[PDB]
Amino acid sequence: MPAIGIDLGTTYSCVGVFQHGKVEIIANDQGNRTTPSYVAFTDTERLIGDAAKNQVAMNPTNTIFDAKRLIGRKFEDATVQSDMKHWPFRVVSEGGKPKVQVEYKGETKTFFPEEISSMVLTKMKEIAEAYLGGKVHSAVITVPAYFNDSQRQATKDAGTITGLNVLRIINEPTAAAIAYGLDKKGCAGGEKNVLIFDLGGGTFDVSILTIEDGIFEVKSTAGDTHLGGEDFDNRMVSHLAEEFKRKHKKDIGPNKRAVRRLRTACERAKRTLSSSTQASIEIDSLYEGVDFYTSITRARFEELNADLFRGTLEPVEKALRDAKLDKGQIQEIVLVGGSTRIPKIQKLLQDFFNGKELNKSINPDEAVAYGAAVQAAILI
Ligand SMILES: Nc1ncnc2c1ncn2[C@@H]1O[C@H](COP(=O)(O)OP(=O)(O)O)[C@@H](O)[C@H]1O
Ligand SMILES: [Mg+2]
């Protein structure tokens, strides 16, 4: 039985396995190679993953996400208190630790962040067991490079609750570097600087690593923990909500379900705009029985996000400054995260790096799990 690599992500999680010399990223039971890091509770059910994310429109107060923003933190931490103001679910304090509060089968229940993340890990373990047959024993789990020991330990605790032997907790950018074999490339010293540009659903991370004799050293990190694909979706939502109001004289703003359904449609369209120059929006009965069918272009999407896309270069500059490197001293640039599929992002980054080709042959939203799966097989 092989060990698995799990990317336990802020917005999505991904599981891979290394068998017969190669990594397979494992599809879940809806056929998807990534699974939303979502857990929903009702009077009769606990849903995890696609099932949870797909019903958030109908169940916003008891659908938990963003547990990674709480894990290993204290309730009174400024980051926790700030994030709470933007979540539809309730967070409370128990012994100084944050817990999410939900209604579940006739009772108010509270869960530690590591309990929620354990539910997600159990789903990833179950996906892997459906794929492999039998029971999974061991896993490498990834975390952001900036995670402190409390955050790492709480992630380990989620693994323990799930019943996994956590072989190692490794950093996300290191996992990405491992996926590209950057620790097995070259023999002479020098010119071993890699920049990992990781733009996901909720966070943006730039990391510079130097890799000598198979030893990864994190030289610098930069980014924005509140910049990701969800923010690009929201720019579309504002734009298209204005359009619906203009065309149909109805303001969907006060209706949570309508806004959520438009947001889902926008995320779908956004993904399409990474490979096509136009995308359709088709929402039956968006508001008061009125359908919203429309079209959006890649160009318009880029305009709606022009500042956010261009702004990703600032953390790159900062990471370079902190590492005491010039952009010309980066030997490899690696794209990680689903949002790095956006053509304009790729173009801005490649232009910043003076035309240098980017590493993107591994699906960017799978690269962390891929490297975790490689490392798990190595650790046996
Ligand atoms: N083809 C695509 N084009 C643009 N954005 C995408 C595409 N595929 C996925 N995304 C976005 O990637 C984000 C999720 O990033 P991912 O790296 O998979 O998860 P996480 O950030 O949780 O690690 C979401 O905002 C999603 O909409
Ligand atoms: Mg990620």
Author numbering: 5 to 384
Sentences from the paper on this structure:
The 70-kDa heat shock proteins (Hsp70) are chaperones with central roles in processes that involve polypeptide remodeling events. Hsp70 proteins consist of two major functional domains: an N-terminal nucleotide binding domain (NBD) with ATPase activity, and a C-terminal substrate binding domain (SBD). Hsp70 proteins bind and release client polypeptides in a cycle that is coupled to an ATPase activity. We present the first crystal structures of four human Hsp70 isoforms, those of the NBDs of HSPA1L, HSPA2, HSPA5 and HSPA6.
HSPA2/Hsp70-2 is a constitutively expressed protein with high levels in testis. HSPA2 is essential for maturation of male gametocytes and is linked to male infertility. While it is undetectable in many tissues HSPA2 is involved in cancer cell survival. Crystals diffracted to a resolution of between 1.8 and 2.2 Å except for the HSPA2 crystals which diffracted to 1.3 Å. In all ATPase domains except for that of HSPA5/BiP the products of ATP hydrolysis, including inorganic phosphate, were observed. We conclude that at least HSPA1A, HSPA1L, and HSPA2 bound ATP in the expression host, hydrolyzed their bound ATP, and subsequently during crystallization never released the products of ATP hydrolysis into solution. The overall structures of the four human Hsp70 ATPase domains that were determined here for the first time all closely resemble the structure of HSPA1A and related previously determined structures.
